[PDB]
Amino acid sequence: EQYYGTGRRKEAVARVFLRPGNGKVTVNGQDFNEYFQGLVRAVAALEPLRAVDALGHFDAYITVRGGGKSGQIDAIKLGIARALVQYNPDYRAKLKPLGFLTRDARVVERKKYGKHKARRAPQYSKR
Amino acid sequence: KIRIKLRGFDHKTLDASAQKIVEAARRSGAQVSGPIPLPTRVRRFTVIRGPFKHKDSREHFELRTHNRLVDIINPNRKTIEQLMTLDLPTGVEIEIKT
Amino acid sequence: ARKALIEKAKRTPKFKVRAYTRCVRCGRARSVYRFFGLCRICLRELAHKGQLPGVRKASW
Amino acid sequence: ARIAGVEIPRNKRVDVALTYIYGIGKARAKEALEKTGINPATRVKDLTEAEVVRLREYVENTWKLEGELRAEVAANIKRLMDIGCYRGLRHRRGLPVRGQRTRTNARTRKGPRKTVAG
Amino acid sequence: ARRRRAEVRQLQPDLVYGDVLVTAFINKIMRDGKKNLAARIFYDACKIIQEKTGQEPLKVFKQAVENVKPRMEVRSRRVGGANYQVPMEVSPRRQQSLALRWLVQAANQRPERRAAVRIAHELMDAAEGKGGAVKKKEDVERMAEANRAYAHYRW
Amino acid sequence: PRSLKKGVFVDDHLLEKVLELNAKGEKRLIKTWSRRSTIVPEMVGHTIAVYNGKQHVPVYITENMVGHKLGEFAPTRTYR
Amino acid sequence: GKGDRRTRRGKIWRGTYGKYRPRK
RNA sequence: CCGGGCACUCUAACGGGACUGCCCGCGAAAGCGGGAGGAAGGAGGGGACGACGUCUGGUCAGCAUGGCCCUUACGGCCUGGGCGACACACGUGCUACAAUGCCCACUACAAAGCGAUGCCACCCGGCAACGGGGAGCUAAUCGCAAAAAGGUGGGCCCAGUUCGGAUUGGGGUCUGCAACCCGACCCCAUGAAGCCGGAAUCGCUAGUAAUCGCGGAUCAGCCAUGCCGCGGUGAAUACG
Numbered sequence: 001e002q003y004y005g006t007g008r009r010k011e012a013v014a015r016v017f018l019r020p021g022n023g024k025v026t027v028n029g030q031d032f033n034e035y036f037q038g039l040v041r042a043v044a045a046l047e048p049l050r051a052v053d054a055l056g057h058f059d060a061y062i063t064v065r066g067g068g069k070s071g072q073i074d075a076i077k078l079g080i081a082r083a084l085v086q087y088n089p090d091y092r093a094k095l096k097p098l099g100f101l102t103r104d105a106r107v108v109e110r111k112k113y114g115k116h117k118a119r120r121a122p123q124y125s126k127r
Numbered sequence: 128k129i130r131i132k133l134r135g136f137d138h139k140t141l142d143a144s145a146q147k148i149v150e151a152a153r154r155s156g157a158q159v160s161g162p163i164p165l166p167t168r169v170r171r172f173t174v175i176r177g178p179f180k181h182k183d184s185r186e187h188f189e190l191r192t193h194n195r196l197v198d199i200i201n202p203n204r205k206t207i208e209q210l211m212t213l214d215l216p217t218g219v220e221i222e223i224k225t
Numbered sequence: 226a227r228k229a230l231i232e233k234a235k236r237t238p239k240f241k242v243r244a245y246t247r248c249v250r251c252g253r254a255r256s257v258y259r260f261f262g263l264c265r266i267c268l269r270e271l272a273h274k275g276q277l278p279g280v281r282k283a284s285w
Numbered sequence: 286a287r288i289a290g291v292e293i294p295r296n297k298r299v300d301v302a303l304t305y306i307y308g309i310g311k312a313r314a315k316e317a318l319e320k321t322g323i324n325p326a327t328r329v330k331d332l333t334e335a336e337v338v339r340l341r342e343y344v345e346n347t348w349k350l351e352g353e354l355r356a357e358v359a360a361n362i363k364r365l366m367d368i369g370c371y372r373g374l375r376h377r378r379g380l381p382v383r384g385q386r387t388r389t390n391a392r393t394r395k396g397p398r399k400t401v402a403g
Numbered sequence: 404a405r406r407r408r409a410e411v412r413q414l415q416p417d418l419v420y421g422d423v424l425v426t427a428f429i430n431k432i433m434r435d436g437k438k439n440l441a442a443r444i445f446y447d448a449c450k451i452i453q454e455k456t457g458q459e460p461l462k463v464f465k466q467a468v469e470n471v472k473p474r475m476e477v478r479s480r481r482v483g484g485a486n487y488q489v490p491m492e493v494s495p496r497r498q499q500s501l502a503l504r505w506l507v508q509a510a511n512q513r514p515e516r517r518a519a520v521r522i523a524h525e526l527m528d529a530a531e532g533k534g535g536a537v538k539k540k541e542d543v544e545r546m547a548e549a550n551r552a553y554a555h556y557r558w
Numbered sequence: 559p560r561s562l563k564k565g566v567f568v569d570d571h572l573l574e575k576v577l578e579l580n581a582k583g584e585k586r587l588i589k590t591w592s593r594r595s596t597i598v599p600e601m602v603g604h605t606i607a608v609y610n611g612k613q614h615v616p617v618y619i620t621e622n623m624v625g626h627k628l629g630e631f632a633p634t635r636t637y638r
Numbered sequence: 639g640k641g642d643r644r645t646r647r648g649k650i651w652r653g654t655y656g657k658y659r660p661r662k
Numbered sequence: 663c664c665g666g667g668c669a670c671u672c673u674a675a676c677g678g679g680a681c682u683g684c685c686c687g688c689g690a691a692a693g694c695g696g697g698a699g700g701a702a703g704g705a706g707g708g709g710a711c712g713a714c715g716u717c718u719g720g721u722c723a724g725c726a727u728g729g730c731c732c733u734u735a736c737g738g739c740c741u742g743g744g745c746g747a748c749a750c751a752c753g754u755g756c757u758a759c760a761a762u763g764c765c766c767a768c769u770a771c772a773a774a775g776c777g778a779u780g781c782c783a784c785c786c787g788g789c790a791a792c793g794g795g796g797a798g799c800u801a802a803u804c805g806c807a808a809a810a811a812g813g814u815g816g817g818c819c820c821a822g823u824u825c826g827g828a829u830u831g832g833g834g835u836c837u838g839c840a841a842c843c844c845g846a847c848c849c850c851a852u853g854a855a856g857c858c859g860g861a862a863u864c865g866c867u868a869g870u871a872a873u874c875g876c877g878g879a880u881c882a883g884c885c886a887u888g889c890c891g892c893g894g895u896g897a898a899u900a901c902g
């Protein structure tokens with residue numbers, strides 16, 4: 001009937017709803033390529049489907065908020081994989097070596113005092 | 128429909144003194160929708176460690192205001208019995224509207 | 226903090242602009258946080274003694 | 286063609302070409318092409334003699350341009366100096382007149398850097 | 404890397420040709436962290452590789468990269484009071500790095516007005532064995548073996 | 559490219575002084591510590607000693623000097 | 639660039655508004 | 663947006679979870695190499711945290727304090743000037759020198775913060791700064807607010823230019839008793855040096871460098887390009 005996943009990347013969340021159908025994807029009411037497209041990376045979001053050979057089997061309704069559009073792409077990429085897992089658990093063993101179900105823990109590193117940004121040190125002369 | 132806003136510097140004190148209001152209003156009153164967390168207001172102060180020069184020292188402090196919700200449905204007059212004044216908490220401040 | 230300069234507090238500064246804040250504790254002119262009314266040094270000292278309610282060491 | 290004094294802009298957009306007029310920047314060019322109803326996109330070589338005549342008509346006397354402009358500025362500075370103003374002094378010894386630090390920088394006003402011993 | 408052996412970063416495959424080498428090239432083209440504009444440049448370049456050459460831009464690319472790879476380079480060494488230029492082999496990784504880098508640099512040295520054209524033309528010329536990149540390669544391989552006498556300083 | 563606002567500022571110390579002179583005459587000089595005061599037409603022809611922080615400088619004022627502050631005619635710093 | 643008072647980016651950098659960077 | 667509902671997102675309290683626990687190999691052991699499962703492994707990432715002591719390090723000018731010294735002035739009030747001087751020299755930075763770019767128009771995604779003599783939606787006047795009017799907000803409920811780079815469309819066509827905005831002339835707005843010395847901001851005109859920088863020299867090993875914007879503290883205003891934070895996009899390389 002319907003299958004759900006979340007996923008997150010770089011402080012961006014996406015609700016991913018897989019509803020069996022034609023394969024047309026919706027994000028925030030817009031077409032998939034309305035939101036993306038002008039972004040080369042975009043297609044990567046749908047990589048889980050292409051991995052399990054889903055594609056035109058499931059349709060998708062996706063809510064997306066947080067981060068920038070690339071992080072949103074990765075979060076979507078997770079959510080699709082999670083919902084896909086909830087559908088058929090036997091997908092996990094196929095999906096895992098690609099690591100699509102792996103959350104990416106990389107986050108903007110805090111700025112530290114005395115530095116310029118978080119690492120970069122103020123330059124000096126000494127003479 | 129009684130609006131309550133609980134603010135304080137101690138999350139322990141707030142969270143604990145809210146459930147007192149809730150439990151007091153449960154017996155004498157409605158389902159008591161219960162505390163909704165609300166975001167915290169964090170105020171930072173960054174200050175140089177030393178009295179002289181040494182601009183690279185810092186060590187900032189933070190002062191944070193936690194919030195709580197309550198908001199009991201069915202403002203029964205029987206409820207204000209266990210309610211009104213019975214409380215432990217000191218550094219909690221309470222706001223109330225209709 | 227020279228003692229005559231603690232004439233800072235004046236109901237009659239003669240102009241609103243001539244009114245400047247100082248540290249209520251040590252009498253420091255520069256680096257005076259408006260929230261605490263203190264200066265930065267006193268701020269750190271008292272914060273370390275635990276005399277400023279809610280003020281904690283921040284890390285993240 | 287020849288507009289507002291001895292200067293002839295050529296072979297590029299009329300606005301950008303009008304920029305080469307002394308007292309005329311991008312704003313006044315935009316405005317002049319606006320009130321004269323000329324498409325700013327056309328090349329100067331594509332301007333109708335009618336259009337050029339109209340442009341000249343407007344621009345020539347609406348704002349003070351070129352030589353008269355320069356003369357006016359020179360007369361302003363000369364005035365500043367003659368009255369004994371402070372700005373007059375800063376103009377006199379060639380230092381920043383707008384109240385900027387002369388300790389370092391202030392090079393463009395002071396010109397090339399003349400080094401001595403230390 | 405004083406302690407470890409410093410393992411190599413694996414790159415995500417290309418979104419089009421599914422090749423990691425492509426991605427690497429994309430990254431070398433990248434400037435101020437704009438990947439999108441980079442991909443724009445390279446793919447436009449690929450579409451320029453056709454209707455010039457009838458072949459597949461992938462093949463042209465890979466073969467150019469293969470032609471730019473130096474087999475020998477010269478590294479300096481301090482020996483007994485002087486500094487000698489010592490010839491020696493180039494590990495495959497460094498071959499790839501130098502190849503891609505040189506391709507991009509030579510590309511931006513070109514006269515052509517816009518990026519994609521520059522990358523395309525450089526890619527082609529290098530693929531058939533001419534152009535700035537190959538000039539670099541041959542210059543380096545010439546430096547080494549001109550220094551042949553120092554080959555026993557190898558290390 | 560300067561500015562002040564509508565309601566131009568002139569210190570009322572000498573403002574009444576100069577017209578007090580104008581009523582009965584010209585007299586001689588003046589001594590003013592306020593250099594922040596704008597120049598107005600009624601001042602023309604007079605002479606104003608302006609404090610440069612050290613001494614009072616005898617600034618004679620003309621028709622073309624109107625609108626500038628007195629301090630512009632009394633430079634504070636001594637250079638070379 | 640970011641130093642041109644009369645440009646959009648100039649306004650953004652300088653943090654102000656005006657003729658070249660409207661408030662809508 | 664209304665009814666309606668805590669499933670999801672989020673918010674903020676408690677709690678679970680990872681310990682070389684399991685498999686193979688090496689080892690006397692501690693442990694090392696690899697693999698499985700897992701969101702995460704071998705210190706998962708980043709903070710707070712800096713030993714006995716060293717530099718007769720810095721600060722009596724934040725405060726405290728021994729000694730010494732001035733007490734019609736080495737104390738005190740005020741107006742004005744100065745800390746903003748400019749032949750020069752250095753440090754840290756900002757903006758650039760352009761087409762992987764600049765400009766105009768339209769359009770999309772964030773986090774952390776601040777807000778009552780405050781933030782100021784919306785309407786009108788003004789090219790604009792801004793002015794007049796005025797709703798909401800003790801603020802997850804209103805405002806600052808526009809995020810920018812990005813995407814789409816169009817202009818520029820390699821030139822000191824539609825690059826770059828210093829300098830200077832003129833006209834204004836705001837704060838403030840008061841912008842000459844010595845404020846910021848708007849508009850018109852001006853349109854400098856600069857074509858990637860000698861010897862020398864600096865930072866950074868991953869969401870880092872690079873790049874793009876956003877907020878705050880102090881403060882009437884502001885010389886903030888500084889500092890302290892926030893997120894967007896997101897590399898190269900490490901033989902040794």
Ligand SMILES: [K+]
Nearest residue numbers: 393396854855
């Ligand atoms: K010059």
Ligand SMILES: [K+]
Nearest residue numbers: 481482483484
């Ligand atoms: K040696």
Ligand SMILES: [K+]
Nearest residue numbers: 705706707708
């Ligand atoms: K840790």
Ligand SMILES: [K+]
Nearest residue numbers: 717718719720
């Ligand atoms: K000592």
Ligand SMILES: [K+]
Nearest residue numbers: 758759858859
């Ligand atoms: K450079």
Ligand SMILES: [K+]
Nearest residue numbers: 435639640873
């Ligand atoms: K830039």
Ligand SMILES: [Mg+2]
Nearest residue numbers: 108109117893
């Ligand atoms: Mg960042």
Ligand SMILES: [Mg+2]
Nearest residue numbers: 114183184185
């Ligand atoms: Mg330290």
Ligand SMILES: [Mg+2]
Nearest residue numbers: 226227228252
């Ligand atoms: Mg004292």
Ligand SMILES: [Mg+2]
Nearest residue numbers: 242243244245
């Ligand atoms: Mg003040």
Ligand SMILES: [Mg+2]
Nearest residue numbers: 245246254257
């Ligand atoms: Mg103060």
Ligand SMILES: [Mg+2]
Nearest residue numbers: 304306307309
């Ligand atoms: Mg001109």
Ligand SMILES: [Mg+2]
Nearest residue numbers: 385386387746
């Ligand atoms: Mg000066």
Ligand SMILES: [Mg+2]
Nearest residue numbers: 405406407408
């Ligand atoms: Mg070793």
Ligand SMILES: [Mg+2]
Nearest residue numbers: 505508509539
């Ligand atoms: Mg080269």
Ligand SMILES: [Mg+2]
Nearest residue numbers: 562563564565
């Ligand atoms: Mg006025």
